[PDB]
Design a protein around this ligand. Structure first.
Ligand SMILES: O=C(O)c1ccccc1Nc1ccccc1
Length: 136
């Protein structure tokens, strides 16, 4: 197999900045103690592609998570804050768009390459958090 469109995301990334993430978690419904501990985390993100399967791992002092998925195909995900959600991830003009649905709620996580950074935009009902990763 040759190059994949998600290949621009492949690599090991480290969180270098975060804005409004506490407010975002509040809007998602995250409880106090989880918000405080999760907000301290400086996770590493490891993204790989094998054929049609994309894997995104997050390693931190808070939790280690891993999702593997095929674009456009819904899957089960247990989030770092231990929500049990139904997730679909697609590629839209070079942006990975991740929708999570649970308990009649929805949130959208967009991951995009900007310069040498991986920028993560987390949106819930008007609240947006921007998390910036650099190569590790
Ligand atoms: O950093 C992200 O892209 C991110 C986006 C949405 C939810 C969680 C996220 N990461 C994370 C948060 C706390 C502990 C460990 C990892």
């Amino acid at each position: 197999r040759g190059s994949h469109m998600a290949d621009a995301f492949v690599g090991t990334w480290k969180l270098v900045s975060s804005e409004n993430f506490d407010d975002y978690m509040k809007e998602v419904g995250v409880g106090f103690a989880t918000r405080k501990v999760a907000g301290m985390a400086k996770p590493n993100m490891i993204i790989s592609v094998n054929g049609d399967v994309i894997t995104i791992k997050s390693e931190s002092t808070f939790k280690n998570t891993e999702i593997s998925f095929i674009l456009g195909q819904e899957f089960d995900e247990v989030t770092a804050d231990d929500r049990k959600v139904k997730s679909t991830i697609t590629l839209d003009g070079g942006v990975l768009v991740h929708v999570q649905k649970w308990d009649g709620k929805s949130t959208t996580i967009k991951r995009k390459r900007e310069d040498d950074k991986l920028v993560v935009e987390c949106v819930m009902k008007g609240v947006t958090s921007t998390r910036v990763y650099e190569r590790a």
